[PDB]
């Protein structure tokens, strides 16, 4: 999971990318109170995080070495043996992870939720995997819509994102789903000061991602779909 009354999400609440505005829903599952909950591909939000932390070779506001970051995380590791066939019980040919953040209708009363899952894939059929994942996307979309009734939480959109790797023989695949809860450095807020904390958040809440990249002199790593997951 949850981000609630104390939180913001990179790419939606702060540093919002115009793609969040460009984004067409994939479909809308009917959530319990009658509202249609649009479902969207979270690849905007995902691209936004990459922008803010940077990458291992162009590191930006990554979490401090040795820090303690509480994360909502799940992750799976699986091996593919050298060409073996009826392989050991914790092996497979592919691996996958998924995340969905769902924004609450009233964030003063209810929280926004994260669903995270991950698993291994048994067949070598990449085309089978991909379809199972769209099937699983559609599945998560429903559990959300349902389970919100139990605490009577009403949401307004859900953004689901997936990532996967097929192993070649004799290679291990690792797949992780993580949502970190962090605090932001001053040299990240143009015009920000350690002395103006609350305004600092407001600056980030108002800058768009392209604006922030220009202001900081950073090259948009999203570019036009430069990032694959």
């Amino acid at each position: 999971x949850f981000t609630g009354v104390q939180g913001r999400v990179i790419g939606y609440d702060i540093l919002r990318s115009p793609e969040v505005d460009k984004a067409k829903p994939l479909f809308t599952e009917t959530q319990w109170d009658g509202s249609e909950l649009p479902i969207y591909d979270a690849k905007p939000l995902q691209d936004a995080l990459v922008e803010y932390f940077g990458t291992e070779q162009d590191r930006r506001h990554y979490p401090a070495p040795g820090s303690f970051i509480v994360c909502a995380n799940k992750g799976v590791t699986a091996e593919r043996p050298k060409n073996d066939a009826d392989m050991k019980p914790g092996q497979g040919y592919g691996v996958w992870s998924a995340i969905a953040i769902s924004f609450a209708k009233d964030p003063t009363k209810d929280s926004s939720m994260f669903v995270e899952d991950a698993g291994v894939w048994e067949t070598p059929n990449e085309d089978e995997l991909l379809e199972y994942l769209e099937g699983r996307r559609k599945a998560m979309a429903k559990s959300i819509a349902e389970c919100g009734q139990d605490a009577h939480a009403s949401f307004e959109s859900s953004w689901i994102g997936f990532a996967y790797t097929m192993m070649e023989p004799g290679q291990i695949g690792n797949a992780i789903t993580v949502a970190p809860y962090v605090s932001l450095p001053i040299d990240s807020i143009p015009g920000g000061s350690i002395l103006t904390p609350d305004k600092d958040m407001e600056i980030m809440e108002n800058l768009t991602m392209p604006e922030w990249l220009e202001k900081m002199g950073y090259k948009s790593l999203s570019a036009n779909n430069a990032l694959k997951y």
């Binding site: 913001r8 999400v9 990554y62 003063t108 790797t165 290679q171 992780i176 605090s183 407001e202």
Partner: protein
């Protein structure tokens, strides 16, 4: 943002500033300014690692929330 005004009247604030140069820190770490948190979404899959692909969540100690 009207939300923050409504929120502040309840005692809640979403401020989360890190005292460090360049680096973000994690929620509840000493020396942070503010009583809020900022979150993001990372799903990545890698092979031979996943954590170092795309969004760099560096040499971090994570604790699990559920």
């Amino acid at each position: 943002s009207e939300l923050d005004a409504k929120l502040n009247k309840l005692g809640v604030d979403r401020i989360a500033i890190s005292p460090y140069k360049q680096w973000t820190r994690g929620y509840m770490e000493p020396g942070n300014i503010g009583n809020g948190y900022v979150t993001g979404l990372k799903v990545d899959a890698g092979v031979r690692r996943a954590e170092t692909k795309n969004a760099y969540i560096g040499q971090i100690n994570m604790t699990t929330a559920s």
